[PDB]
Amino acid sequence: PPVSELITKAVAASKERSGVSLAALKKALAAAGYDVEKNNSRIKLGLKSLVSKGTLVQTKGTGASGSFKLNKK
DNA sequence: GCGGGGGACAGCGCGTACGTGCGTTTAAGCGGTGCTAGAGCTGTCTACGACCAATTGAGCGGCCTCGGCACCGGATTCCCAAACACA
């Protein structure tokens, strides 16, 4: 399954008012058996694609270093 | 021993400052010349310090006193830690 679903599912499972950090996303995907080490660069890209698709709102920071929430709009 | 909160450490981004490279300029390095100030050595003779015996008073041990400082309690003050009002 593509990493955009795994990320969206992790952000939905950890839904809050702040927003899953990249470190929490790493932890959730690793707990989901996804190798976050080798494919970290893929994650940053896929995450960026999800922000560029507007599917994730950046709530703090800039780019992948930030916190993110599912764009309910 | 325990609760917790701040700091250490991890991850990311970015932007500019440092490394690499190239061409030009500059002055370091080398050699060579010349001059003279001063370092190094020597002889003299003289004032200056070591040595010694005698004198003595300055300093050291021993006693004694009191005041400066330590201590205690009581009052004064001064930073504190969130909670509140209000943005």
UniProtKB/Swiss-Prot annotation:
Residues modified as Phosphoserine: 67
Modified positions (N6-succinyllysine) in chain numbering: 60
Record protein name field: Histone H1.2
Biological classification of the source: Eukaryota, Metazoa, Chordata, Craniata, Vertebrata
Residues annotated with N6-(beta-hydroxybutyryl)lysine modification: 15, 27, 48, 53, 69
Assembly: Interacts with TSC22D1 isoforms 2 and 5.
N6-crotonyllysine found at: 27, 48, 53, 60
H15 domain ranges (all copies): 1-72
Included stretch of the parent chain: 38 to 110 of 213
Membership in a protein family: Belongs to the histone H1/H5 family.
Modified residues (Citrulline): 17
Main function: Histone H1 protein binds to linker DNA between nucleosomes forming the macromolecular structure known as the chromatin fiber. Histones H1 are necessary for the condensation of nucleosome chains into higher-order structured fibers. Also acts as a regulator of individual gene transcription through chromatin remodeling, nucleosome spacing and DNA methylation.
Domain characteristics, as noted in the entry: The C-terminal domain is required for high-affinity binding to chromatin.
Coiled coil: none
Modified positions (N6-(2-hydroxyisobutyryl)lysine) in chain numbering: 9, 15, 26-27, 38, 44, 48, 53, 60, 73
Post-translational modification: H1 histones are progressively phosphorylated during the cell cycle, becoming maximally phosphorylated during late G2 phase and M phase, and being dephosphorylated sharply thereafter. Crotonylation (Kcr) is specifically present in male germ cells and marks testis-specific genes in post-meiotic cells, including X-linked genes that escape sex chromosome inactivation in haploid cells. Crotonylation marks active promoters and enhancers and confers resistance to transcriptional repressors. It is also associated with post-meiotically activated genes on autosomes.
